[model samples]
Target: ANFIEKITYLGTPAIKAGNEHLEMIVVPEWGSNVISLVDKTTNVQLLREPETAESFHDTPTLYGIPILFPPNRISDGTFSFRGRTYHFDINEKDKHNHLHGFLYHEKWNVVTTKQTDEGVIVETEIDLSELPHVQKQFPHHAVVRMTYTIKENTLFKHATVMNKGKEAFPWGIGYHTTFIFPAESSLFSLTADQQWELDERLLPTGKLMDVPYKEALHEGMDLRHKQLDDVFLSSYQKRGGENQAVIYHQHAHISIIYKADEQFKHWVVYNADGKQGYLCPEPYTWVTNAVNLDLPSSLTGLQVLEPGEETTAKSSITIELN
Candidate 1:
């Protein structure tokens, strides 16, 4: 039960927090990402840790929990709201769209750290006004804050976005949470309601389809030869419950429960054909290209934050090491 104020991770300054059963390491410099989470009882790393600093910098989303602003992609890298048009870089050149927003690559300032009853709490914040690229593109003076709480056997991620600008702007966020996949013995399950159909470029085509393996998902199933890059609608409200998805390992006798608050309306499941020893059950506050989907704002979870107004999104991971 300790909170480390300073530590070096991959040659960069970081912090560590832990309790009796769980410990986590966060690197604020690297997108305020929780780079590591270990189960003290079984010595199991819940997250897929970055192997090296260079590797992480090259592909930050491949490991740990990387925040995705506006989540997935945008058509033509442009969207207009309230008469203001925002344009993001076309990083996905071939796809002719812009992929995940840059919050995961920006630096965040650690604003606070203190000990709690059963764990530790850390807070980080970033202001878009401080980011030249963001100001030039999105042009909203939005302050985004992140909180991490590592209690007994669970880890909590909380995000708050405050609109400090004079005018309102669209808002969206997600987490590219990379988890370690114990391939052979691991099972995956979820309770999503519907899946979003995707075009060749992987952007949603405005169709919500039935999720495959619906029956098998309730109990969990192996993913040895399956490949997935699908998005699911969990619920506009929490009617479906927070058991968004779970990963169980038979050999280790452990289960990882991934849950999200009602603010999160979508889930993007991606596994490199389940052969990559890692999986991403990314949760988003909006659907892919939500701003341009042409669907009702309520139906697509497209939110707008007026000046001085704020919103929050939270998700957690609970480890049951039986």
Candidate 2:
């Protein structure tokens, strides 16, 4: 990867399969938000930075990709964490709740820089201690560090949640990562038996239902359809010791899968009704508004890490070209 202008700049990060390449550029002095994707392939972005309007909408709808937590489009007025509730100034005029998680919108602090065997790796951290608005809503004292590494044909990301306060804090950690495929032309398949239905407002009603698949592969249940936004909750077990939820594109000959240590029990799927050029197969530790759910006192999808204690998750996506 290359670092550009002392002020504003662009540089290459990792190279992809075939003749294509991707670049990740950061304007730290400005926003510190990094935008990454293939340079000039199909004029479609393979990867998008969070919280950017176009990245939130076009990436998912046109590319069949997804944006991370607190997806900005479906804005609600407020979100709650722990026992307290926090309100937000709605950014999307058409919607209610606030959008996507905080990191996407806020500028991140670059920690140390390094180079790896595969490609350049950038490590960054975001300090939430001073964000009064965030603490008011989530009531947790912690720091978040994200590592973005560019390897051949892979973008390896590692996120760590650490408790900074003397007292233990709760966390519902997960990645709202989106993968893109050819819209309308490709079929998406998943292995989930249970699901949760949302109300007209796109908010969960706390109702759990069964997936409408009678067979292992259902036709209309396929993702080729234009519109889709739903959650998949399932019991994760190994088939011959392998995780069950693996997604594939029959026509594209590409597949993406993930497995997490005890922390992840449920996975959420967000489709942009074909509005996004991609489809999102996301994994989440807690359900939306999980803080409101009447979970047991000791165990919630949210986690409690001791002071200076940290929880780390690893996810790898492999791509193959036919």
Candidate 3:
């Protein structure tokens, strides 16, 4: 079977896409999060799986492919562009900033589910104007769409954001993806030379510096005993055939190749002080606080769309035998 429209994840409504090689579970009602992606051959979960429904609700951001809009932190949960001042809730009260915006918590409509020659694909979307919380803050009408496809051992994620209103608006997105990191046999890696200097509040200080772990990350490095929560800027001129990051588990005999389109300029690697059982190699369309940076748009990756304009970003994860 390629598609299953009605499934349950600890009693919550969900859907799945699968083939002989992999099975993917997407909870559209719950922020359209791809809560699970499993390699059917070895029965290994590639993404972090919640231990209980209670835990998932308590910290939904820590699980699956949680989407981050206006990615990362925005200073004071406020920013102004083209004479319009935009505001977001200061969810990260400790830092007095608006964290990953409300998109991940909003319910999405399952737009389509198809059975392709290769596998199955499920598409979902949400309109911001319909949500008062978003209307009060962002005002402009926007439509966001997401699609998940199971192709062999890979799960592809495609996202699109459209300006449905009459005004132009600034926007950005990132994936706060948490991959299962085994303590004894895991290595995490990425190719990046520079990183944003984060302030005491976890916001970018508007400066980019050379990464101390540049080589180690490029060649693959162990995450054990290492504390990290930084945004890395990768060289986009790689032309082609280079993955953004790779997660290897020696004992599991599997590796996960994560590749994002060139539109992505930043990667966020986090481990919550090396104590947690997972690592996040997140990709973002813009650098942290990009819209507020005192830098050129070319360097910050901030993008704006005029009325009726839209753009799409895509990324994928492939599980390979090691």
Candidate 4:
């Protein structure tokens, strides 16, 4: 079996790339989201989503991967930065907080697409300058570029943010990805030294306590009995390296290796209480409500980009079927 690449449509333009062992489907118009990731050897779809989901309003977060800027929630849809107040759209009206950043709904332009012997690469870019409305809210100029590379049994994603504004701005980025749950046979493992306790509204309570699931996670627990929706501070001592999580499906003999750059110091694991048949091991740059809570910048993973400066984050997912 050989690698294949194709351009297909699912309510929007999409790119499909893979080798005989794996495949990925990416839709540039849909927030440059990867809607499907399949393990060809086992004929199993790793992502949980409907066949057709192009609109941000109709699209479910439980599908594919969605980019989260300033990840998580912003209290009262507002934050104070550099002595100035900024207000974001109250998308999560019920909670009166700005849930998930603005990028997930906007369209991303395909900057380049190429193929090589190693794999296929698709690059997309979104310039804040072009989106005056977003700029009006954040008042910062920047360009976010994302590249996806598909290779044998692996998928790589790299995101870069270029600060084009004159003044410094607080920024963070993350990925909200959902994976098909293996129920009783699924095992998830990660190491974290601290975990944030959430309030009634699911916002951090400004306390960093010892990781509650450290033992269970280190021993690999079954997903069927776990109800998880928590954030943790990465221990940075995983086997492959810092910022790592592994998911294994015993019955299917399939496993996934998730690795992210050190910049992603926060990890979010959500089992959805077995309601969605999926689990999300999210990588985030900052904790929820970091800005509003005024927590220590370092502890919260909040970063300030100087004028004309840039930063990048990379994460990879590798699949193996035994």
- Candidate 4 lDDT over 1-322, as tens digits, reads 3443557655666777777777888777777788889888888889876665534448545678988887888888888888989898888878888888868778898887777778778788998879878887888887899988877778898999999889998888888888888776788887676788898778998987887667877777776766888888787733334577888888889888888988888898887767667889999888888787657776788888999898889999999875
Between candidates 1 and 2, the lDDT winner: 1
Model 4, backbone clash pairs (residues 3+ apart or across chains), number: 0
Q: List the residue pairs that clash in candidate 1.
A: none
- On a 0 to 1 TM-score scale, where does candidate 2 land against the true structure? 0.70
**How high is the lDDT of residue 19 in model 3?**
87
Q: Model 3, stretches more than 4 Å misplaced?
A: 238-243
The candidate scoring highest on lDDT is 1
**Residue-level error in angstroms, candidate 1, position 76:** 1.1
What's the alpha carbon RMSD for model 1?
A: 1.4
Rank by lDDT (best first): 1, 3, 4, 2
Give the alpha-carbon lDDT of every model. Answer: 0.86, 0.51, 0.85, 0.81
Q: Is candidate 1 or candidate 4 better by TM-score?
A: 1
Per-model TM-score versus the true fold: 0.96, 0.70, 0.96, 0.92
Task: Judging by lDDT, tell me the better candidate of 2 and 4.
Answer: 4
* Residue-level lDDT tens digits of model 3 in 23-98: 9898887788999988998899888878898888888889999988768888888998998788888888888999
Q: Give per-residue CA lDDT, model 2, range 269-317, as digits (tens).
A: 6666666555566666656555555664222255567888997765544
Off by over 4 Å in 2: 1-34, 37-45, 48-99, 118-120, 214-222, 237-252, 258-262, 296-300
lDDT, candidate 1, 1-322, per-residue tens: 5665689999999988788888889899999999998988898888888788999999988789999987889988998887778889998999999998878988899998989776688899999899998788788899999988887788888999999989888989999999999778899888776789999999999998877677776688887888889988885463555547899978889999988887788889999767789989998889999998889866688889999999888888899976
Model 1 C-alpha lDDT versus the unseen true structure: 0.86
Q: List the residue pairs that clash in candidate 4.
A: none
